[PDB]
Amino acid sequence: SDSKTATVIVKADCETGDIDEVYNLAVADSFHIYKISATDSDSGNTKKLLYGLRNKKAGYTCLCRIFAEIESDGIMANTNIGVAENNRDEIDENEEGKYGFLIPKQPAGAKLIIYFFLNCWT
Amino acid sequence: SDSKTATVIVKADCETGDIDEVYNLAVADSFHIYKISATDSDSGNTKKLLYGLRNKKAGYTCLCRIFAEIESDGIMANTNIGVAENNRDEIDENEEGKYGFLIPKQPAGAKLIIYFFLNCWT
Amino acid sequence: SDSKTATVIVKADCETGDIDEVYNLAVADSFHIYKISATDSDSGNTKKLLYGLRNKKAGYTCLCRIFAEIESDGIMANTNIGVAENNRDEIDENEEGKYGFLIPKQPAGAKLIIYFFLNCWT
């Protein structure tokens, strides 16, 4: 039967990893997105930011694909993002997908914007 | 009551700032997008491109989130984009949100593609 | 009469060009996406990856806009993408749009993620 898709745009802080905003396209109670972990490399030149998305839709199985980009007021810093953890499989109800990003150290104030492309069905 | 979302993909010229195309996903009369300003830095190494989006939907209040990327036939130029003006707040009817981008000088022909993620309600 | 939009996220391999996954947002039989060509530059420092999208929707004419990004577990490589072939025009039934990308040589395992923004009508 029923099939649904949603796009959720998450703004997170590049220094603490904290989530600043969860912005739903067309869904707020259907998913829970949370910081799992934010660790510096011992060099301090990179940052590892790890997030989880939990399917909270009773009845539904979900797929999740992602895109992420650094949002910054400067233009001189490296903004490549390395993908680490990435759950490409089905995500049952109350199961989580984990999405990890390796980012270069950013200037103060820089943000990580993560786009979750959700495809769910019963 | 009613709630709506739209994605609008705008192609603008990196040298003049002029808008080449307003491409609506699922909306053409609901919004007006326009160049406000295009200024070189006195160094001439960067470009400041500023756009406005006006809510034209009678009854509706809107949120707007953005993504932008340089579209270019080369691969050797810096394509980092610095975010400047960015209206994250509610946008009432006939109110505008202003979105400003700091870009590096690009080779001839390069374009700025701006994605507007619109979430409107009554 | 009727009007429709779809987003299709394609994962392709940066070394062979092969398509790993066609991920439809809200469509699987409406379009066919295929590798046309993958060629090294004789320098071997760049890669030219060319794809076709065929409209398979009986009755429909389509527009297609694209976004592409390198998905990689590292952060040290150039990930600029040069746009080459790009069909901006109408695409009739069983007509194809061709989309070509110039990418820098990537580390093993790196992927090209192409986003097709489809707007179709009768």
Automatic annotation (TrEMBL), chains A, B, C:
User: Domain of life here?
Assistant: Viruses
Indicate what this protein is called per its UniProt record.
Envelope protein
